[PDB]
Design a binder for this molecule. Sequence first.
Ligand SMILES: CC(C)c1cccc(CNC[C@@H](O)[C@@H]2Cc3cccc(c3)OCCCCCC(=O)N(C)[C@@H](C)C(=O)N2)c1
Length: 377
Amino acid sequence: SFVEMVDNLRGKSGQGYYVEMTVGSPPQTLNILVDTGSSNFAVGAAPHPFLHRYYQRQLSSTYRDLRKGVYVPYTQGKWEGELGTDLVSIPHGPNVTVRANIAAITESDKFFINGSNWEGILGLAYAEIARPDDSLEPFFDSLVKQTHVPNLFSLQLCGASVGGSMIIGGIDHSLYTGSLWYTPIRREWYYEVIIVRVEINGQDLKMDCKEYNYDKSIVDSGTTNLRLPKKVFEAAVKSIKAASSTEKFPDGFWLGEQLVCWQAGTTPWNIFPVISLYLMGEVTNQSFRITILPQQYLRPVEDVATSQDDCYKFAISQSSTGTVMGAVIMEGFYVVFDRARKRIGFAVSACHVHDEFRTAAVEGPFVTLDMEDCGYN
Ligand SMILES: CC(C)c1cccc(CNC[C@@H](O)[C@@H]2Cc3cccc(c3)OCCCCCC(=O)N(C)[C@@H](C)C(=O)N2)c1
């Protein structure tokens, strides 16, 4: 019965992927951002300029106040509110209702996005990073404990205005091609993984693999860009700059500020390199790689002037809190969050990014010695 969840995600480019949910009795419908980079389920619960609707606790006969405050600071944006519980369902999801923790957002700062069409956020990571502390059980833990939904979910994030699928409880084989390749979840807090090698156009960056995971590497559907530690970011940009030097870009382009444009249909994709990320595998000295096309890390953006040229934003930014494999990395892959077996699977998505001569890929096996040494401690 996973067909009922195919195409249950929508969104606008760069404004996150969201799924429809209901909270309370009678059910109040809200669009909820799908975020594997945090662990709090929170919804707008007070008027806000960018909110078209919000959770009205007074109108829910099943609402229970927990008499406890909460706030969450993200990398960008934050909110505060009041903790409580209520009945929650996913219309295009499993046919179940669960009582879950809900943070009623009463105040926020640079969190909600004008015209995003979502009113809350579903943190799908583990209790260890929940606010105010790990005793506040995350939504997915409650779903698994209260129903028979198996302890895993899979995400198919599709590019172009955007759509995708969140399969709750399993793997839908109609959403991918080829083989699934699995990397261990290093520790159950974020979805933490270990990157063991990085290549750009087949050239090894030749860095200490610890640099790739300093101070951690996570799979984060709630972050748009690929975010890289300072030293790795500098090496990647230098390599990407050289490969595309036949064209000039403003320096602000490489910072994610300015947007580059070309005549409609003349974007020179061939001058931008592919990025291969090698992930620790399931067996001794074995890794696998996922290859990222430039159509993934050059996010298309609405032409500020006369919409007559294809314009893009550089979707790779610098990080001071480790590597983030964000939405642009996940797009075109089918990513399986196999919580039950502490692993994350990758396969080419059925909605894969199309280049003419190159293709996004998930390939293995590879031999990589000393993979354990790549984890930061
Ligand atoms: C909460 C704790 C556990 C924590 C602290 C710091 C970092 C993390 C890692 N995970 C971050 C995500 O949880 C967050 C979600 C989030 C917050 C606000 C808006 C969101 C998603 O959608 C809008 C779509 C556009 C996304 C733009 C974008 O890339 N962002 C807004 C990044 C910068 C980010 O901050 N996204 C987790």
